[PDB]
Structure 1
Amino acid sequence: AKYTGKCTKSKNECKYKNSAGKDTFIKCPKFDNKKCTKDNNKCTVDTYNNAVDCD
């Protein structure tokens, strides 16, 4: 089940909801598209293969 939330550009961490209903914080990629280039921005998480997309 894909998740959606926000992300921080200060520590590059995506905030989503794990497969249960809580607050999970992971580390976004350092790519040039899936990286967190904005604080409190919006990022999508894909547990299907750990494919985080920050922007």
Structure 2
Amino acid sequence: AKYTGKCTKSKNECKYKNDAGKDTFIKCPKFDNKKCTKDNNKCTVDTYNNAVDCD
């Protein structure tokens, strides 16, 4: 599935709510694009492939 969440810069992590309403965390990639560039930026998670892209 594809979820949209919000990321935090320092921890470089995406937080999204799954369909049960549970906050779930998945680290952004560390190097260049796909890393979180500002607190509360959008991030898109693909739970089929365990992949995230952070803004």
Q: CA deviation at 1:20?
A: 3.3
Q: CA deviation at 1:50?
A: 1.4
For residues 12 and 6 of structure 1, the distance between their equivalents in structure 2, rounded to whole angstroms, comes to 10
**What CA RMSD, in Å, does the superposition of the two structures yield over aligned residues?**
1.3
CA deviations over 1:5-25 (Å, ceiling 9, x no partner): 100001111001235331101
| Displaced runs of 4 or more, over 6 A | none
| Corresponding residue of 1:23 | 23
Unaligned residue ranges in structure 1 (runs of 5+): none
Deviation at 1:40, TM superposition (A): 0.9
How many residues matched?
Answer: 55
Structure ranking higher in strand proportion: 2
